[PDB]
């Protein structure tokens, strides 16, 4: 299930100038474009080698779009201050997520287009791509205005047409990096704790994509409660890492086995200490 998504954020800063405006684009949850209004020379920039193959009219057109969006968001941050009747001297946040998920054939599966104010839901386009869900009375104003203007049709034109179409092109031109598969390299470390028992830590390193499951068995039974587990984290080089640990008696370490499941593995790895 592929996807093309854009995450947009504007943060006001009273007495420090105009709001900081940012865009990030992702394909299959992997970052590839980025815009930062506070950058030395602000323009749309490549963030993966594969997108670099696009010509200069692509970067100019997207830079043109980004700088226009930044202007629409300057207005909106002001429109939001009055709806909620807030002081003008404080910092606020407007976030915008938009994109398309696609099933194997190629045509749309779900369209997204939702906004959040100060970290809370504000308005979101329903699955029908025809109506809007508002979170409070402020967003009800926005809803009827966008209803009167016909915002769903124009927004739906993007999601079903262009978004779907360009994602199809991004996957063809970037398949080698996007759809690559890096199997995790696994190993187990030993750690004698003061209490007298042991911590067995099972590491997974250098894998892509991100999804993975670490599980500790004992004589075939999963030990999902006594297990410790960090959130999957980025290595910094495009791959990911994760570890899972358990506490076991000294001497019986060879009874426990760690199981690593990843789409780069035809079969789950199994390892002991």
């Amino acid at each position: 299930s592929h996807s093309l998504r854009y995450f947009v954020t504007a943060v006001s800063r009273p007495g420090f100038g105009e709001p900081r405006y940012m865009e990030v684009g992702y394909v299959d949850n992997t970052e590839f474009v980025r815009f930062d209004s506070d950058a030395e020379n602000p323009r749309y920039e490549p963030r993966a080698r594969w997108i670099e193959q696009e010509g200069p009219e692509y970067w100019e057109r997207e830079t043109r779009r980004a700088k226009g969006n930044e202007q629409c968001f300057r207005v909106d941050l002001r429109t939001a201050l009055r709806y909620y009747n807030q002081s003008a001297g404080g910092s606020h946040t407007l976030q915008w997520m938009a994109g398309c998920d696609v099933e194997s054939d190629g045509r749309l599966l779900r369209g997204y287009w939702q906004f959040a104010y100060d970290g809370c839901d504000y308005i979101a386009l329903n699955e029908d791509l025809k109506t809007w869900t508002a979170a409070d009375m402020a967003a009800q104003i926005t809803r009827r205005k966008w209803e009167q203007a016909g915002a769903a049709e124009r927004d739906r034109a993007y999601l079903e047409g262009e978004c779907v179409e360009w994602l199809r092109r991004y996957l063809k031109n970037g398949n080698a990096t996007l759809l690559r598969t890096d199997p995790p390299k696994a190993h187990v470390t030993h750690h004698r704790r003061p209490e007298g028992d042991v911590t067995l830590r099972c590491w997974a390193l250098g894998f892509y994509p991100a999804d993975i499951t670490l599980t500790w068995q004992l004589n075939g039974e999963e030990l999902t409660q006594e297990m410790e587990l960090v959130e999957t984290r980025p290595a910094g080089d495009g791959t990911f890492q994760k570890w899972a640990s358990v506490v076991v008696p000294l001497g019986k370490e060879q009874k426990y086995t760690c199981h690593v499941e990843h789409e780069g593995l035809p079969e789950p790895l199994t390892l002991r200490w």
Binding site: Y6, V33, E62, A66, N69, A98, Y158
Partner: peptide, 5 residues
Amino acid sequence: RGPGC
């Protein structure tokens, strides 16, 4: 490509 406003 991305969306606008």
